[PDB]
């Protein structure tokens, strides 16, 4: 699904 620090952190913020 969606990660906390792996989706919006170290990769890109939405």
UniProtKB/Swiss-Prot annotation:
Tell me what happens on changing residue 7 to E: In ETL8; decreased affinity for GALR2; but no effect on affinity for GALR1 and GALR3; decreased activity in GALR2-mediated signaling; dominant-negative that inhibits GALR1-mediated signaling
**Identification of the protein by name:** Galanin
Question: Where in the full protein does the shown chain start and end, and how long is the full protein?
Answer: 33 to 46 of 123
